Swiss-Prot record, chain A:
It is found in: Cell membrane. This is Calcium-activated potassium channel subunit alpha-1. Potassium channel activated by both membrane depolarization or increase in cytosolic Ca(2+) that mediates export of K(+). It is also activated by the concentration of cytosolic Mg(2+). Its activation dampens the excitatory events that elevate the cytosolic Ca(2+) concentration and/or depolarize the cell membrane. It therefore contributes to repolarization of the membrane potential. The protein was initially thought to contain two functionally distinct parts: The core channel (from the N-terminus to the S9 segment) that mediates the channel activity, and the cytoplasmic tail (from the S9 segment to the C-terminus) that mediates the calcium sensing. The situation is however more complex, since the core channel also contains binding sites for Ca(2+) and Mg(2+). It is linked to Paroxysmal non-kinesigenic dyskinesia 3 with or without generalized epilepsy: An autosomal dominant neurologic disorder characterized by absence seizures, generalized tonic-clonic seizures, paroxysmal nonkinesigenic dyskinesia and involuntary dystonic or choreiform movements. Onset is usually in childhood. Patients may have seizures only, dyskinesia only, or both. Epilepsy, idiopathic generalized 16: An autosomal dominant form of idiopathic generalized epilepsy, a disorder characterized by recurring generalized seizures in the absence of detectable brain lesions and/or metabolic abnormalities. Generalized seizures arise diffusely and simultaneously from both hemispheres of the brain. Seizure types include juvenile myoclonic seizures, absence seizures, and generalized tonic-clonic seizures. EIG16 is characterized by onset of seizures soon after birth or in the first years of life. Widely expressed. Except in myocytes, it is almost ubiquitously expressed. The S0 segment is essential for the modulation by the accessory beta subunits KCNMB1, KCNMB2, KCNMB3 and KCNMB4. The S4 segment, which is characterized by a series of positively charged amino acids at every third position, is part of the voltage-sensor. Belongs to the potassium channel family. Calcium-activated (TC 1.A.1.3) subfamily. KCa1.1/KCNMA1 sub-subfamily. The chain holds residues 1071 to 1179 of 1236 of the full protein. Homotetramer; which constitutes the calcium-activated potassium channel. Interacts with RAB11B. Interacts with beta subunits KCNMB1, KCNMB2, KCNMB3 and KCNMB4. Interacts with gamma subunits LRRC26, LRRC38, LRRC52 and LRRC55. Beta and gamma subunits are accessory, and modulate its activity. Phosphorylated. Phosphorylation by kinases such as PKA and/or PKG. In smooth muscles, phosphorylation affects its activity. Palmitoylation by ZDHHC22 and ZDHHC23 within the intracellular linker between the S0 and S1 transmembrane domains regulates localization to the plasma membrane. Depalmitoylated by LYPLA1 and LYPLAL1, leading to retard exit from the trans-Golgi network.
Amino acid sequence: ELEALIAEENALRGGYSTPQTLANRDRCRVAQLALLDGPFADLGDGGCYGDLFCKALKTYNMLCFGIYRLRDAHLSTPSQCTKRYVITNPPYEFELVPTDLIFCLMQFDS
Amino acid sequence: AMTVLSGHVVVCIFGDVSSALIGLRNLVMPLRASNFHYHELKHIVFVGSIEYLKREWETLHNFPKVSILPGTPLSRADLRAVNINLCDMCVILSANQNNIDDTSLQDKECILASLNIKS
């Protein structure tokens, strides 16, 4: 429908807010969450990815689908590199470190 | 859109400032012949680039009912403004034929305009 409107007018047309359009606002968005101080901080220190996924899905209806992990995290020696790489769909028994980011699809909240 | 046009002629032109002239007067003189009455004359609305149409206006400014809508024939808003559903005839003409090297692709804009209007 938006495609047809853009085809018709070659622009974006504003409009007043109606309950149908406000209900159309509720979607899911891509986000990254840290385990340093969030509600899942007690699980990021050695916990498995499966418990995090189950808790996020049951409580906040949050769909975790990947880990953004520091490159120099498996090394025992400390490092100053802040680069992170992507792990797509880790298994249930995949371990977690506190310096990790979680990809998620978060619901709209009002 | 404010004025109402019914039973008129809409000439869509794919012109350009550097394009070759096509001599639009040869289209207006048969439609402006003295054999017709003044009330029987059909209004002519040219839809296209104004840069091209300024180079042709020196031979069209002596005719009674001619109007210009600066725009693009492929835009549906311009076609809806001139009441394309009420016109007696829509004529699609192309002026950028020499630029295209391939001869079979010289009719892309006219075919696209025809399909856009038909839909």
